[PDB]
């Protein structure tokens, strides 16, 4: 499935997507991105849109 990431960092914002066999695979992918970009925050998921948000 294709999953989305909304970046709501204090300094750094965007929307990334990733196709992954399951949500856990996509989400580990997306956490790696927030980590490497220097965005650390609270995470929440919206099942109906397959969209994670990270809010710093
Ligand atoms: Cl797919
Ligand atoms: Cl990506
Ligand atoms: Zn897929
Ligand atoms: Zn990626």
Listed in sequence order, the DSSP H helices in the chain are: 23-37
* Resolution stated for this PDB structure, in Å: 1.4
Q: How many whole angstroms separate alpha carbon 25 and alpha carbon 56?
A: 22
Q: How many whole angstroms separate alpha carbon 23 and alpha carbon 18?
A: 10
Q: How far is the CA of 12 from the centre of ligand 3 (A)?
A: 27
**Please, are residues 56 and 38 in contact by the beta-carbon 8 Å criterion?**
no
Q: How far is the CA of 17 from the centre of ligand 2 (A)?
A: 5
Closest CA to 28 of 10, 6, 5: 5
Q: How many whole angstroms separate alpha carbon 1 and alpha carbon 50?
A: 9
38: three-class secondary structure by DSSP? coil
Using a CB cutoff of 5 Å, list residues around ligand 3, an ion: 1, 19
For residue 14, give both structure tokens: 């965007």
10 Å CB burial of residue 44 (0-12, 13-18, 19+) is exposed
Map out the domains of the chain with their CATH numbers: 2-55 (3.10.20.10)
* CA 56 centroid distance within chain: 12
Q: How far is the CA of 22 from the centre of ligand 4 (A)?
A: 15
């Amino acid at each position: 499935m294709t999953y989305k990431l909304i970046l709501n960092g204090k300094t750094r914002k965007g929307v990334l997507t990733v196709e992954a066999v399951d949500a856990a695979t996509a989400e580990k992918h997306f956490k790696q991105h927030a980590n490497d970009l220097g965005v650390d925050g609270e995470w929440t998921y919206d099942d109906a849109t397959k969209t994670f948000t990270v809010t710093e």
